[PDB]
Amino acid sequence: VNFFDELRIGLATADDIRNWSYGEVKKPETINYRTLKPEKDGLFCEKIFGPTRDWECYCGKYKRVRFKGIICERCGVEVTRAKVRRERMGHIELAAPVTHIWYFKGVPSRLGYLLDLAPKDLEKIIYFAA
Amino acid sequence: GIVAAQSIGEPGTQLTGGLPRVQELFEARVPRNKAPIADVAGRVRLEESDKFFKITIVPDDGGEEVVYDKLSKRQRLRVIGVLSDGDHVEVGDQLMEGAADPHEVLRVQG
Amino acid sequence: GRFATSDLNDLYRRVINRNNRLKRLIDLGAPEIIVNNEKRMLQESVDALFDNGRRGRPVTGPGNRPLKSLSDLLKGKQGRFRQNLLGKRVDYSGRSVIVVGPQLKLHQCGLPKLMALELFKPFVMKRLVDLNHAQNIKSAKRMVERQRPQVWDVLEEVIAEHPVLLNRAPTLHRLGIQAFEPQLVEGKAIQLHPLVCEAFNADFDGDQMAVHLPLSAEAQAEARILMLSSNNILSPASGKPLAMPRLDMVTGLYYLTTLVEGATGEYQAATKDAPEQGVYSSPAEAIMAMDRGALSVRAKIKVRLTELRPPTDLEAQLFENGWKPGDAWTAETTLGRVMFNELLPKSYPFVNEQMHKKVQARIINDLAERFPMIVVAQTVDKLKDAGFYWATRSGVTVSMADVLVPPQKQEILERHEAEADAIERKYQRGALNHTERNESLVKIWQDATEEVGKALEEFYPADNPIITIVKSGATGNLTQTRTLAGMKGLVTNPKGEFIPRPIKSSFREGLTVLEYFINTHGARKGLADT
Amino acid sequence: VTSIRIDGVLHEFTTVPGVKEDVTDIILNLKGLVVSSDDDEPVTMYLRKQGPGVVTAGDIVPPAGVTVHNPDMHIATLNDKGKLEVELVVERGRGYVPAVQNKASGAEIGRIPVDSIYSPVLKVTYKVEATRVEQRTDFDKLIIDVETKNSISPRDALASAGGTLVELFGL
Amino acid sequence: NSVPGAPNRVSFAKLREPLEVPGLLDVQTDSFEWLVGSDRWRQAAIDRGEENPVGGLEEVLAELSPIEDFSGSMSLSFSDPRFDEVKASVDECKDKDMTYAAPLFVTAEFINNNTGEIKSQTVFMGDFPMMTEKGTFIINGTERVVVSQLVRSPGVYFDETIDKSTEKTLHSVKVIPGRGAWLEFDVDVGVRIDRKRRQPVTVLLKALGWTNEQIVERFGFSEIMMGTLEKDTTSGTDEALLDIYRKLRPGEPPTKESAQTLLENLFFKEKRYDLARVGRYKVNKKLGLNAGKPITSSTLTEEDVVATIEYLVRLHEGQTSMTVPGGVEVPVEVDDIDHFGNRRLRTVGELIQNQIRVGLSRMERVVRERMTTQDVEAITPQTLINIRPVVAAIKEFFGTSQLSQFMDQNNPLSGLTHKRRLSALGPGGLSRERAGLEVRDVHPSHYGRMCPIETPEGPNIGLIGSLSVYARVNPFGFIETPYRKVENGVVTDQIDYLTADEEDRHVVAQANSPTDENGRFTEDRVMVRKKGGEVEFVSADQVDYMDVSPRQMVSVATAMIPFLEHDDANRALMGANMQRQAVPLVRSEAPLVGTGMELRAAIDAGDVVVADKTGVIEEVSADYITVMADDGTRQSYRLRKFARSNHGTCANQRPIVDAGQRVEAGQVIADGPCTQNGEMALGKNLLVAIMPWEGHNYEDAIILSNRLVEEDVLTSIHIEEHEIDARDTKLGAEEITRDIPNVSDEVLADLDERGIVRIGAEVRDGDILVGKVTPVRDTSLKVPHGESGKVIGIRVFSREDDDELPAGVNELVRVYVAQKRKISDGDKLAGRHGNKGVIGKILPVEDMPFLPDGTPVDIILNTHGVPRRMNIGQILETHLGWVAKAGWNIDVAAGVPDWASKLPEELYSAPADSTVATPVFDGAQEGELAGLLGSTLPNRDGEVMVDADGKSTLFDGRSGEPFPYPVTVGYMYILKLHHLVDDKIHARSTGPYSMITQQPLGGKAQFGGQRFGEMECWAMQAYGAAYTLQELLTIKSDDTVGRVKVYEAIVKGENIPEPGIPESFKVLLKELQSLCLNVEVLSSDGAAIE
């Protein structure tokens, strides 16, 4: 199509950030030092992000181009193009809610001008000193 | 816009005052030689102090005369023969040789 | 084996770690202090992730360097917005060194065949599969990859009116990019047109250019109509013709058109005995009289012209009813001016003048405002070809004999010593100070420079190549001629102040080590400024 | 000379045991040779010299219907340690050709291409005499100097040129 | 003249050379011999000046030692830096790809005070890199060179800056040290230590220990001095000491005992505050205190500090006369940081010494702690000392440092001029952006020390200077120039090396001075240099010094530009630079017009092979020469043949001598790449014509005859290196082997049993060089695009072999590929006068314009590119070139012609191909050239080609006619530059794309596309070629669906599909989505999806 007249912005709500995301990363691991493969439910994870090689699952059961739009029961990776690894956004569920630094440490503070308080006091609230 | 931009931008290489004056005028900053303009139209009278120029402009309309005190002796008066006591100066024209502050010209002459 | 990992990974790791630990502390049922501390750590981790080195100290990994945040992708000169969006690498594009291509028409440019072949590889492959040269695409790809003899018959059939955008960095002005018809050339250089060199500000002193192949029909069109060099002769500055003759062409046409007394085949107008002699039935006759040793191109001859339109005053006095598609009228001109007007368009009137770069400027301006752009494009190309042809047989060549010195340079200089030394005789007594002396010296030696600057032109003959080059307006100034022959005069210090002892010697004579060493300042200063 | 093949060295950019000049400079000197052949087909000459002395162009042993026209010319200087065995391939052409690559043709790693100059003429010039004044039908007499390498005589060359021009003027 | 066995080059030298051209690698070798503490230096230090020599290492150890623990029970002092036998010879390091280094010992005595027993041992510091006689360091088998750094000398620099408010001259001094805190005194604010603003001078003056009376007595007739002690709030010593001590460091308990120790530790102490010998010297000589005293003195304790303030108040007051309490009288005047009296040159030795210092200081920590941790008595300096920090500090100095550059080996002269290079920039030096327009500019002190002409044309103009010919380095590091003294108008032959300081104290006349045979100013008034840069013209009585010979001020590179003084500094600079770009040519040939410096440059450059010992040549081979000495020994000089130089050029050395020649001590045996009979021969003598010719030579292009592509006169050998390593991975292990799974026989026919291409097999852009297999996948080394030709040698290093590989490698292989570059079109040529240009057209020799004898001219340069550019050097060089090529005889007369009155003897007659020397500033002249062109006619025919004006009647080969006016033909020596089409030409329809950035990976080597920048986009927008820009910044770069579809669409011959959205947008979108900025796409009616 390549036809969008205007471009609107805003603030990413947890709902919209969840709606964006395809899977939830829930382990602090990138790639295995031995084999150099992506780690399951970690960063670079094929299940949540996308497949390493073009039309190839993690475990290595479905590696054919013929089929598309199916999730492998063993690993849970979807067999599509690799380019999605530079598209399919992820997310992290914070056990405790965390504010954005841009609406806080900005000069003047947007949260600070919204809720009407000193930035030095707002610092103490966010950084658990009050 | 871009035609004009590039047209103005290109022959900066073929200059030597020069590109400083161009970028100073385009960036709309206060000049290196702050030569004031006439705030009101009237007749000029210049008193020569201890190595200083006291210019007073007596107005034609009927208000307060424009007075200046502390400007350097090596700024030089505008050639309009040359500016001395017993002359009538316009609100538009520059007073001394150098560069007229744009902000000053805008607020006075629109 | 070694990893060149991005910093984001470490921040995301730090966040997910502290998130997992916090979730484990929530699962455990821990006290408030450790949970609030872990929440502070998490808060600081996400804060650092979104903006590193904003609140207090930045996060660092190997060797005390701050981690590239998510916002650090966007901010800076190496930002996404700035670096990785405004200037990119491009496919279907080449770069090479430019050479002159004076055989080429303005709209044409010469492309190195070994470049061209690769630059149009798919386009030539398409036509190679269209023809029964290649059986399938892969064999065409292989054929063009191998550079087989059959490709060359096709590559012109493929390149036929498929223009290319030539660029010369830095791309200052709009014409700094121009579209051209790529003519194949054997070599590894881009044969640029001589006129467009000013439109690129491109010398042939190693300066590279970048070819781009516009692929889309729309692009091909845009190239052809908007920015094809022929279509935009006039600069987008003063609306003056930028693609006009400069350097050689100028001296070529200057020599071609300029008039000379006491020449070969000259107009005499003899009394009693002989006829007028310097009178010729046709420009053809005059050309035959020139090529055979009998007529000199720069002779005030009386030629009878048919194809050319006369001067505005001579239009009225002769015809003033019918036109001259094939009539006849007499002109007291130079063969060269007729060979010049032969280049200028049919319905354009006669000039009968020496073709100074300004005269060329106003002529090509008149052509630009009066005639279509194609007429200008072509006429200025004929002016280029003719100009260059006549640049050779101009006889513009430099020699130690050709570069002269003014014979009064001894008299006028030494006199200007007698005024200077005198000041010293005034100083030693104690009247004038060093600073006023230092200025009066500058005045005196500037006057001395001026005297030589004038005196040079009074002595130097007209045909003198040095005088040709400058007084044509081709290139160079009377300043450069004065600092080449006579003396450089006063040269400036690196502060801006002038040195009171000048260069009292021509570059022809050669400077003394000191006079040179003083000259170095202003030149290095100039190089540092440019 | 179109391609030379020294049995020892495997490429241009090395040296032979016990020679003064390097293989590049030997090739560069063998370009300086002047030879003439009857058969236009590629003919292989042989130059074999073992032990000390100055290898000249006269020491080359050409086959039947090939002649060297500068025996005096210095190629390489040897010692008792060094042995120079070089075969020089000659072919009849015209003008100049670039050093044709053996990778393109069906030629082995041993064969070294050399920048062939199929130009048996060395120099040509001319001046024209005005001879007689403008009155009584003036004519121009041209005198041309033709200077060959000794591959062929000026006569042969000028005749070949004249022949080429006569062939080249079609009507 | 002076050179033992050089080919006779007739000279246009009017004066006699007083001083011979000294060692052109002295500023490298001598400095490094001063660092090492070598015998040749030691003797020179014993002879010249002070009678107590100390080597760089001896000094840097002497200053450091003794190392001692906090208690002061055990200590450790070093001495005697002995240099034992070197690991291997220079060639073997370049062969084995190791470093050329000497094992370095130091005698170390572990002293124990409590017991009274000293344990002595020889400590092996490591394989310390040593210098070659060529003046280079071979690091990891690469000839690197340490460029000498220009800096502001340690000392006290007074300045005066104008105020915007008050408009008064405040006199601000800066006390720059070797290492420590930087003191500076102002007036209107006092002292400022490490940006400690507002600290009146009286507080430290008191705090050190001056009573308020002694300040009033010492200051004398000062106003601001009496103002500063009046303005001081903290009156008394301890009050002022506690006042300054708290202000110096915040958050520390301010005690007297700590303050009084810190005050005298920060300045007066030797260990904490690193005093400089050059500093002590400078402050002693300039302030005038400790006059006629020994060197290696202490720092500025008190006397210097009060003397500098005494100087400052006298400067601020404004009196030229001064008398110091204790010191001698000295004139008072401001100092300039650019002026060479203050601008010192720290050189290889000192730059290595400064890193040895830091290394041994990084060791001193480890030793100092190791002594406190380890038990007493049962410890030896073997175990205590760690060698790693020092060898690491040196390997760091030869591992990315701006003062340790690659040798530019484009030619000998490029290397030679890469040595004796004065760098303003680098660590412990001013930055490229920080450097102003004033410091870049030349200074009247530069004259005869740094070259005013030679400097790059890029952004480093003025900064990267080059040391002048006769200049040398003083032991301090001050650049000294030689002069001849003159006494009451009678010139002496006493060659004296003066520094930029004492220079300015004296009166120096220029070398072009009329002399009375022996030495006496025959001219009544001489042209002279006065105090500073006043090019005066004064009486002979007043003058005390004079320039030895002319071209003092010129660099070795710039000194090979014949008729330099007829050029401008710009084109001179351009030519001087171009000569350092000149490529080496297959045959190579010397200029028919050069300068005397070309004979000397080639031999000292070090690529030429010289005879150390006088003798007869026993036998000559292409590989090596063996000479039998008069001493009786046999020297076997090894030559290197088609060895790769740093900048991809040939290091091919030719033996010039025959198998029974006679060689004297210091005579050339074998030429290096750019040498013909032991003189610097970069380019070639081409028959130049000077006329504009049918467009091809327009806007400085150049046209040359196919003759050059035929004869291979300008042909170059270019050698490129291609490396690959069998590095270990976690899956398996890499191996260099012939067998590849996915190939044909044709692509592996050139390979051998090893699995690498055989020596001499011609390679094409794409062909396999090294067959390598990754655990199985093919990761073979392929020759890059725009590169082809023969393979010289394959240098292999295996795990099986004993050679040193880098950590995590099984088998390194390094392939040398040679290509024989013919001078094609677009390749850049240039004279020695800046007259550069690309090769326009290669005219088939016939059509090129020719001389009436038949000789067709080799190049044509455009006339129009002479007057505007202001370089008529090329024309004089062309003319004297013609005079040189064709033999000549100045038909003398009964008693000489008038034009040759000031002409050299034994240069009336000369034969064909007669090489000529013209001293760059005192060579051939206009009236000499004019008459000289009046030559004989040696063209085998008996007619002259040129005329008395040097303008030949050329014949047009194109048309056939003779040109209507006579053309300036002659023989200009022209150089092939390194700017070649084979490097610069790029092309890309489609190929491999980069992984991280989804645009074509940029590069000539990587088969890359060109950068379509912002300024290119502005021009495209200014046209309004929307679809063009929207193609270039989408399917022709970023768009992954576009880049694959466009190729298919073009090759099928369909419409180009509409460019969708670039990856450069998607990445920004996803980046802003990752920054939690909810960006969404929607039109007037209906919202879009990503």
Ligand SMILES: [Mg+2]
């Ligand atoms: Mg340029």
Ligand SMILES: [Zn+2]
């Ligand atoms: Zn799977």
